[PDB]
Design a protein around this ligand. Structure first.
Ligand code: DGD
Ligand code: CLA
Ligand code: CLA
Ligand code: CLA
Ligand code: CLA
Ligand code: PHO
Ligand code: LMG
Ligand code: LHG
Ligand code: BCR
Ligand code: BCR
Ligand code: BCR
Ligand code: FE2
Lengths: 34, 32, 301, 438, 75, 31, 32, 61, 335, 37, 32
């Protein structure tokens, strides 16, 4: 059960880190013509 | 009017015919 | 992110995929897939669950003498209440299944998935260069899902009160909810019924009017209804189509959220009385008699 | 000088949107709205005081503000009894007069005054894209909020005190002497899960923790205010956020909707920052009090109303077993390390505990929109819906609406930043440049 | 002729200044005088139950229902 | 004057006003 | 009785406090 | 005493109603604030002073 | 004068010309059936909710005069003794006595029949207006669904039952009573036809919301379509997986979903009119009977239906004169 | 209840809390007077 | 008479009628 707990925690942390870093990667919203 | 029910039903028939005639005459008069 | 020359970042945000993943999809796809797999598995085969800690193992698995209509994923045991019950807390997998843990797993993963689904809707609204309010419209069914799966357990203090993930389970949840909170008489659910009926009404009218107009509209509707149509321009008509069902469902979800915290529907029992004080029955107290039947039969004890 | 749709591009149903770039008129609207908030505060405080009988409990009379003032130890004695109603009246009156001042100010800056005060008053002028000045305003308001939190701290510590409902023999206006400033204790409330048991910050169980957390938040907000006044956002901050008025409104809406949900849950569950002597029994508290009073009544004339928790503790039996996490001032004295112990339930029970339990049983948060108490299958005999139910329902509704508003405004802010607010460019579209195979 | 013109004009207000209150008062006398109970058959608050009948009335005869309702009511 | 729209509006309104008066009167009724 | 009459008077005065301002602006000054 | 407080507070009620009626129309009417600044400021000062004296009477009572 | 091939003007031509004038309100020939019938249906309902009582039919006080509000006011159906009598003012019962006719509950029959004919007149009005401007009458075909629902639940269902008593009375609370009555007796939720109808209604609401949101969001900046079909198609292809590539078929689907749902609901209620109901699964019933420990949400639903029936029949069916002693009323603790 | 000195002024207080609704209606009626510019 | 003033008056009377209806909902018949 503890192994499952650690595995699930690692999976969730990995996916949330991917989410956060991905949104940090996206270029800021800018207007090319203005 | 052999029965009160038949008398009432015939009265209703004539009343509805009167209503239809009235609406027909109204549309006729208001047409022109 | 930034994996192998940012190839992973390029692929996640790539719009050439048949289904746009997106950074919100990075959380939706695993969450929704986990919820889907666990729901399918539990529906197909799962031991009976004590929906209440009275030790009455309600069964909702197909293999346990159920059909699609009757089959359901039983809510979590009332003994667990609002406690977090993942697999690693139960003494064994059998105990986890016996207390209805799959229901919390599915509900949590599915709620996260639908939230990230609103997120993906925004992401592809922004990527394709259009106005991002399809997520706002989708917030209505998501709001109702949260109300029935998360807010109602929170208010009632137990996940056993959440809607079972089934059809007959859904009907039982609705019957119980009417018994305990008089859902029909609450103005917010009344407004939600108005929203759904008007949504169907306007869907039918819009379909018929556009189908008839597409010979290759405004005058027909104007002569039909005596007040004519204010939404002469198609943009306003389509905003009205968006707004009516959306806010109706927002308000029914909010009504359910309020009843979660024990704010029931209108109670007009004994509203009208005789001169001597004798209670004169109305439709309200016949609804009350029905509610009494549902309430007494619910309390299996 | 209200302009019109053609000159601003916003119709009357979006009229306030015309104030995005009118700094002075926007400030006037904000001050008028603050005057509205304070007007309602004072008016409802006065209304409830006019409709408040000290002998009855506040929750029996549907009072919302009066519990809030009483929780600060204003005109309340031991056990939740009311000594005098003057503090509540003066609170309401001061709110009303301050609201008059704020309303006069809000009418100013809006009807007549500098429409755009960017040049006349450079200190108060701001451009949404101007990160430095927006951070200056943010830091000023962080300093104000930290000062408010420290004012609460001073009220609790160096004043008459705060109403501690966990004091022995019920509760009373206690003066906090050693608030728990331990960082680990303070932040464990954040780290605590928001599920049953832990409960997140809604599980605070003593005014010491509340005042310590308020000390910490006041200090942190002061430090953040001086930090933001003297700093510009980092390149990552400038890259990860949309810098426009509607973007800031979106951020505030999301945070404030989260806060609304938090307030709903804390008012529904917490009974230390929301003492049950004023706001009435928590739903879990009502059920546990029902079980406890049935237990003592049947003992007057163990398996009937006691069982074993899944963890192992001794808890109340029946459908109230789901509420075994409830921790009340009237129940803890007879609670041992192994849940509830029979010896204390046999001897420790004082009459005040039984009286409070019966009172909480009678006034359960069950209710209806007709202000009719009891389950939906109950005749019209009583008129009571607990203030906890009203607060939780209203603030959940408001929090959900403001989350929806965050969604709307954040979508619109991203569109405006990227130029999609008008629509899809007719000449060319992002879709027309992509492969037809979806 | 259009709504704006007809409701804006004072002729509508003056002609309907003596009629709308007249209809409101007509309804008020219709209710207060008890004529509504007499004409629509609604029992008054003091006659829901008679001395003979102390429960909700029930009509069994399908054809001979006029006399049954006459008996069940106060009449 | 006695147009179709006139007839429709009056048929919808005169009973409406009468019923509103009746309802308001019974609001303050005995018991 | 008298308290209800005073409440009604206060309510109508409040209800007119705003419409009075808007009608005054519409007539006097014309800013509105 | 009590009657003096009641009359002063009724006067405050009426002055506040007058301010509600006047300050907005004074501000929004063209050339309104100009040439009437003295009148509106005197009204506001009277309202504030009357609130203060009402509070003083309340303290005495 | 005017006609196909030099046809002399007749009275019918003048009447048709007057009835089809482009005045403020299109009367049309169908107007003669719609306006009287619809007006009298609305008036009858309003009068019944305001003045007429339900004391002598249902043993209820349901009107504004008696003390009921908008929610609890209704035009109660006639007593079960009247069976399927149309309850004319001149009928064998209430022979011209308007007061007693109102007391008999005949006002419900008045409202129901005049509303049925008003619905027929409104469908005919849709046809007439569609022909007037030469458009396909798809709106009349769409309205065939609500007419089917009304005929099934207000006319066919009571006709299949013991009388008008079990029709839905025209009222909010009364309609809720009807809904709970179906739940308790017919297990109308479990009926597959109701399932299809609710699926259609919720799908139509979904289509309304989604179409409005997407058309308003795929609008073009600043004779020609105002929103980007390609953009919406791509968005839904890459979000959901399926998207509408044709506006014609999209709007026809929006038309078809609710109409089909309501028609299947009407078929199901026709079935319920004869008590032909998908109440129970015999296999699950026997499994539960043989195995006391076995329990599912379906068996719980059956128990709740039994509770509704037994606890409501005492007041909802006065004609039966049911007096259930407290010992026989089903209870959860008695299982 | 209210203090004795303000006891006669109960009725006005009874209408004070409803005034924000009157403010939103005031915004709407002012816009109507403006004719929805 | 301005149309907006007519609308304001109609809305105020409608709000008053609604308030009267609810008051009766809380006192008199249908109030228990
Ligand atoms: C994100 C939400 C995560 C799931 C939260 C589930 C939950 O059970 O959260 C509830 C918790 C409170 O938890 C409770 O906290 C309680 C603390 O009270 C205890 O301690 C108190 C102080 O002594 C009292 O004594 C009280 O009686 C005693 O029980 C107990 O621990 C309870 O067991 C425990 O359930 O709220 C919180 O953590 C913080 C607020 C969470 C708000 C979530 C609301 C749902 C919002 C979903 C979105 C809506 C739709 C939007 C549109 C899309
Ligand atoms: C946050 C609200 C806010 C903001 C940003 C402003 C900003 C401004 N006002 Mg406005 N004003 C406000 C509220 C506000 N005012 C209110 C509530 C009133 C009614 C009393 C007025 C009445 C008013 C008038 C009549 C005038 C202005 C003027 C001005 C400008 C210059 C003011 C200045 O620098 O002198 C500041 C001078 C001081 C002496 C500072 C006093 C600060 C003390 C300490 C007050 C207490 C503040 C403290 C934080 C406590 C907070 C209380 C809180 C709990 C409610 C500036 C654009 C003037 C202008 O534009 O023309 C020149 C002008 O003529 N204002
Ligand atoms: C309570 C919330 C609130 C607040 C604070 C504001 C504030 C404002 N709005 Mg917004 N608005 C609101 C709600 C609100 N509105 C709502 C709900 C709607 C929908 C109907 C609108 C629709 C709307 C539009 C369409 C426009 C505004 C505009 C404005 C500005 C008016 C500027 C001006 O010259 O006045 C114009 C008005 C007048 C000259 C007459 C107003 C007189 C009223 C009756 C005064 C009432 C005063 C009060 C009752 C007395 C108490 C105070 C006293 C003690 C001194 C101002 C900043 C305008 C603007 O600046 O945009 C460019 C504008 O165009 N608003
Ligand atoms: C801090 C809060 C806040 C602020 C400052 C703004 C500010 C703004 N919004 Mg946003 N908005 C918010 C919250 C906020 N909004 C929330 C919470 C929602 C979700 C419901 C929205 C949804 C929203 C939409 C959909 C739109 C705006 C728009 C606008 C702009 C013009 C609005 C206007 O003129 O008012 C006009 C005011 C009215 C017409 C009055 C509305 C009256 C409401 C419908 C009745 C409410 C009844 C009752 C109180 C509800 C209680 C519910 C209860 C159960 C809790 C302006 C920039 C518009 C825009 O163009 O933005 C640029 C726009 O299209 N907002
Ligand atoms: C024009 C539209 C219209 C329509 C379609 C209806 C339709 C209906 N009404 Mg309504 N009604 C209307 C207008 C209308 N009414 C008006 C204007 C009034 C106000 C006076 C009423 C007042 C009213 C009341 C008070 C009642 C009805 C009722 C009814 C129903 C039964 C009527 C019936 O069978 O007898 C009328 C039917 C006929 C006259 C048959 C018509 C066929 C021809 C024209 C007659 C025969 C002519 C022939 C040449 C002579 C044969 C002679 C032969 C005997 C030898 C039916 C649903 C009753 C009901 O069911 O309520 C529960 C009821 O109680 N109506
Ligand atoms: C409860 C839900 C509901 C209501 C109230 C409703 C109402 C309406 N829909 C109409 C149209 C439509 N309905 C449509 C699709 C749908 N409509 C639906 C559901 C509803 N439709 C659904 C689910 C669909 C999807 C299939 C279409 C396609 C149309 C139209 O073309 C038409 C329109 O233009 O839409 C605006 C109008 C019919 C014309 C008229 O005035 O009647 C004239 C006839 C009358 C009034 C006589 C009937 C009287 C009936 C029997 C009631 C009498 C008693 C009282 C008045 C009511 C009692 C109420 C209590 C129960 C509370 C009307 C506004
Ligand atoms: C011609 C068009 C007529 C439209 C009538 C609409 C229905 C209102 C009837 C009057 C009424 O019910 O109030 C009558 C009730 C009377 O209220 C009752 O009066 C009784 C008199 O003895 C007693 O005093 C009761 O105690 C009291 O509660 O008033 C209310 O309940 C107030 C709420 C009104 C809600 C209005 C409907 C809102 C929802 C529907 C909106 C769409 C309707 C139009 C669609 C087109
Ligand atoms: C006390 C009454 C108070 C009423 C409210 C006050 C306002 C006045 C309202 C007066 C009318 C009230 C209703 C009558 C109440 C009343 O007292 O009725 C009594 C009366 C029945 O009287 P008897 O049956 O005793 O009379 C026997 C015969 O002499 C006539 O039937 O009914 C009629 O008047 C005829 C029915 C209506 C007309 C015929 C049917 C109409 C439908 C025709 C449809 C044809 C089809 C067309 C297809 C297109
Ligand atoms: C801008 C504007 C607006 C808004 C505004 C606002 C919102 C304002 C507010 C304002 C305000 C918010 C104000 C206030 C005022 C107040 C006052 C003026 C007060 C007074 C008081 C008094 C007088 C008192 C008395 C008393 C007491 C003390 C207690 C006891 C009792 C008595 C009552 C006696 C709008 C949008 C609409 C439009 C445009 C314009
Ligand atoms: C007083 C109190 C206390 C305490 C308190 C505290 C300790 C607080 C804290 C607080 C905190 C500590 C808070 C925090 C918050 C946070 C947040 C809210 C966050 C957010 C985030 C976001 C929103 C993000 C976003 C993003 C990203 C991720 C990146 C990319 C881009 C974006 C922007 C999207 C106690 C219990 C003792 C007592 C009672 C109460
Ligand atoms: C010859 C005949 C008849 C007839 C009758 C009629 C034709 C009636 C009508 C009636 C009517 C025609 C009525 C009406 C009524 C109305 C009402 C009762 C109304 C009400 C309204 C309301 C309550 C409103 C409200 C509101 C609100 C407050 C919210 C906002 C808006 C509004 C305005 C919507 C009778 C049965 C005698 C007998 C048999 C044959
Ligand atoms: Fe469309």
């Amino acid at each position: 059960m503890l192994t499952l707990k650690i595995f699930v925690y690692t999976v969730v942390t990995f996916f949330v880190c991917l989410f956060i870093f991905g949104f940090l990667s996206n270029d800021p919203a800018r207007n090319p013509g203005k | 009017a052999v029965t009160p029910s038949l008398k009432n039903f015939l009265g209703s028939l004539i009343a509805g015919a009167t209503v239809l005639g009235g609406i027909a005459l109204a549309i006729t008069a208001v047409s022109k | 992110n930034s994996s192998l020359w940012a190839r992973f970042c390029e692929w996640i945000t790539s719009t050439e995929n048949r289904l746009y993943i997106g950074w919100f999809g990075v959380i939706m796809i695993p969450c929704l897939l986990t919820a889907t797999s666990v729901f399918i598995i539990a529906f197909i085969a799962a031991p009976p669950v004590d929906i209440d800690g009275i030790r009455e193992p309600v069964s909702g698995s197909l293999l346990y003498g159920n059909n699609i209509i009757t089959g359901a994923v039983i809510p979590t045991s009332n003994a667990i209440g609002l406690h977090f019950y993942p697999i690693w807390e139960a003494a064994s997998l059998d105990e986890w299944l016996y207390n209805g843990g799959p229901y919390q797993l599915i509900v949590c993963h599915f709620l996260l998935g639908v939230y990230c689904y609103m997120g993906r809707e925004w992401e592809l609204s922004f990527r394709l260069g259009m106005r991002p309010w399809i997520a706002v419209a989708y917030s209505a069914p998501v709001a109702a899902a949260s109300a029935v799966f998360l807010v109602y357990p929170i208010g009632q203090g137990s996940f056993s009160d959440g809607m079972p993930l089934g059809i007959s389970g859904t009907f039982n949840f609705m019957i119980v909810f009417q018994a305990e909170h008089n859902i029909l008489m609450h103005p917010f659910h009344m407004l939600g019924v108005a929203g759904v009926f008007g949504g169907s009404l306007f869907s039918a009218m819009h379909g018929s009017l556009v189908t008839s107009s597409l010979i290759r509209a405004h005058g027909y509707f104007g002569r039909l209804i005596f007040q004519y149509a204010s939404f002469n321009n198609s943009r306003s008509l389509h905003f009205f189509l968006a707004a009516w069902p959306v806010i109706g469902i927002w308000f029914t979800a909010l009504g359910l959220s309020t009843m979660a915290f024990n704010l029931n529907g209108f109670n007009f029992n004994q509203s009208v009385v005789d001169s001597q004080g004798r209670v004169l029955n109305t439709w309200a107290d016949i609804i009350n008699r029905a509610n009494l039947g549902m309430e007494v039969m619910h309390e299996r004890n | 000088g209200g302009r019109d749709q053609e000159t601003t591009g916003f119709a009357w149903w979006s009229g306030n949107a015309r104030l995005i770039n009118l700094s002075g008129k926007l400030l006037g609207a904000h001050v008028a709205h603050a005057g509205l908030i304070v007007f309602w505060a004072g008016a409802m405080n006065l209304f409830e005081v006019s409709h408040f009988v000290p002998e009855k409990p506040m929750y029996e009379q549907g009072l919302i503000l009066l519990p809030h003032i009483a929780t600060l130890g204003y005109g309340v004695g031991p056990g939740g009894e009311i000594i005098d109603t003057f503090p509540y009246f003066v609170s309401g009156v001061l709110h009303l007069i301050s609201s008059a001042v704020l309303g006069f100010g809000g009418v100013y800056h809006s009807l007549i005054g500098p429409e755009t005060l960017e040049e006349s008053y450079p200190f108060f002028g701001y451009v949404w894209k101007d990160k430095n000045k927006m951070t200056n305003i943010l830091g000023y308001h962080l300093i104000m909020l930290g000062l408010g939190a420290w004012l609460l701290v001073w009220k609790a510590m160096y004043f008459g005190g705060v109403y501690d409902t966990w004091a022995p023999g019920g509760g009373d206006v206690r003066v906090i002497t050693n608030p728990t400033t331990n960082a680990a204790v303070i932040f464990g409330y954040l780290v605590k899960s928001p599920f049953g048991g832990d409960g997140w910050i809604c599980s605070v169980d003593n005014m010491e923790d509340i005042i310590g957390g308020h000390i910490w938040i006041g200090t942190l907000e002061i430090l953040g205010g001086i930090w933001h006044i003297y700093t510009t956002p980092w390149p990552w901050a400038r890259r990860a956020f949309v810098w426009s008025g509607e973007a800031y409104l979106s951020y505030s809406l999301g945070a404030i909707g989260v806060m609304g949900f938090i307030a709903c849950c804390m008012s529904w569950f917490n009974n230390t920052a929301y003492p049950s002597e004023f706001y009435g029994p928590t739903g879990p508290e009502a059920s546990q009090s029902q079980a406890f009073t049935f237990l003592v009544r049947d003992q007057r004339l163990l398996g009937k109303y006691l069982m074993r928790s899944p963890t192992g503790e001794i808890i109340f039996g029946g459908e109230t077993m789901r509420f075994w996490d409830f921790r009340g001032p009237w129940l803890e004295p007879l609670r041992g390390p192994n849940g509830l112990d029979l010896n204390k339930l046999k001897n420790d029970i004082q009459p005040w505990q039984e009286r409070r339990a019966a009172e909480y049983m009678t006034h359960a948060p069950l209710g209806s929109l007709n202000s009719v108490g009891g389950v939906a299958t109950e005749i019209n005999a009583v008129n009571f819906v607990s203030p906890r139910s009203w607060l939780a329902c209203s603030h959940f509704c408001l929090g959900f609406f403001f989350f929806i508003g965050h969604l709307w405004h954040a979508g619109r802010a991203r569109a405006a930043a990227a130029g999609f607010e008008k629509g899809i460019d007719r000449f060319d579209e992002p879709v027309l440049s992509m492969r037809p195979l979806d | 002729r259009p709504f704006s013109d007809i409701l804006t004009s004072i002729r509508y207000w003056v002609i309907h200044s003596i009629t709308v209150p007249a209809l409101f008062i007509a309804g008020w006398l219709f209710v207060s005088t008890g004529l509504a109970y007499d004409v629509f058959g609604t029992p008054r608050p003091n006659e829901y139950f008679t001395e003979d009948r102390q429960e909700a009335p029930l009509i069994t005869d399908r054809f001979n229902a006029l006399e049954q309702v006459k008996k069940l009511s106060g009449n | 004057i006695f147009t179709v729209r006139w007839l429709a509006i009056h048929g919808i309104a005169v009973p409406t006003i009468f019923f509103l008066g009746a309802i308001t009167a019974m609001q303050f009724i005995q018991r | 009785n008298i308290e209800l009459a005073l409440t009604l008077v206060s309510l109508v005065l409040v209800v007119s406090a705003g419409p009075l301002v808007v009608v005054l602006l519409s007539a006097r000054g014309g800013n509105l | 005493m009590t009657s003096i407080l009641q009359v002063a507070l009724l006067a405050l009620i009426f002055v506040s109603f007058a301010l509600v009626v006047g300050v907005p129309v004074v501000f929004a009417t063209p050339n309104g604030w100009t040439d009437n600044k003295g009148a509106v400021f005197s009204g506001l000062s009277l309202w504030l002073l009357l609130v203060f004296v009402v509070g003083i009477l309340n303290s005495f009572v | 004068a005017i006609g196909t091939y030099q046809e002399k003007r007749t009275w019918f031509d003048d009447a048709d010309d007057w009835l089809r004038q482009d005045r403020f309100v299109f009367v049309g020939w169908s107007g003669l059936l719609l306006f009287p019938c619809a007006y009298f249906a609305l008036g009858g309902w309003l009068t019944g909710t305001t003045f007429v009582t339900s004391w002598y039919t249902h043993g209820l006080a349901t009107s504004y005069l008696e003390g009921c509000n908008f929610l609890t006011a209704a035009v109660s159906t006639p007593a079960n003794s009247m069976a399927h009598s149309l309850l004319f003012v001149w009928g064998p019962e209430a022979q011209g006595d308007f007061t007693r006719w109102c007391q008999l509950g005949g006002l419900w029959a008045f409202v129901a029949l005049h509303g049925a004919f008003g619905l027929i007149g409104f469908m005919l009005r849709q046809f007439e207006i569609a022909r007037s401007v030469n458009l396909r009458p798809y709106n009349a075909i769409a309205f065939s669904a609500p007419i089917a629902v009304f005929v099934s639940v207000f006319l066919i269902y009571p006709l299949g039952q013991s009388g008008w008593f079990f029709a839905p009375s025209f009222g909010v609370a009364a309609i809720f009573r009807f809904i709970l009555f179906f739940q308790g007796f017919h297990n109308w939720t479990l009926n597959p036809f109701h399932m299809m109808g609710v699926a259609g209604v919720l799908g139509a609401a979904l289509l309304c919301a989604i179409h409005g949101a997407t058309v308003e969001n795929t609008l073009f900046e600043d004779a020609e379509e105002t929103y980007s079909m390609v953009t919406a198609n791509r968005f839904w292809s890459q979000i959901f997986g399926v998207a509408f590539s044709n506006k014609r078929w999209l709007h026809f689907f929006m038309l078809l979903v609710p109409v089909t749902g309501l028609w299947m609901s009407a078929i199901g209620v026709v079935g319920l009119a004869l008590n032909l109901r998908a109440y129970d699964f015999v296999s699950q019933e026997i499994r539960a009977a043989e195995d006391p420990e076995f329990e599912t949400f379906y068996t719980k639903n059956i128990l709740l239906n039994e509770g509704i029936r037994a606890w409501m029949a005492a007041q909802d069916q006065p004609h039966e004169r049911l007096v259930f002693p407290e010992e026989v009323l089903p209870r959860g603790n008695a299982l | 209840k209210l203090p004795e000195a303000y006891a006669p002024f109960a009725p006005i207080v009874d209408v004070l809390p409803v005034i924000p609704v009157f403010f939103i209606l005031l915004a709407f009626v002012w816009q109507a007077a403006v004719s929805f510019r | 008479i301005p149309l907006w003033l007519v609308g304001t008056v109609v809305g105020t009377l409608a709000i008053g009628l609604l308030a009267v209806f609810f008051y009766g909902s809380y006192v008199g018949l249908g109030s228990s």
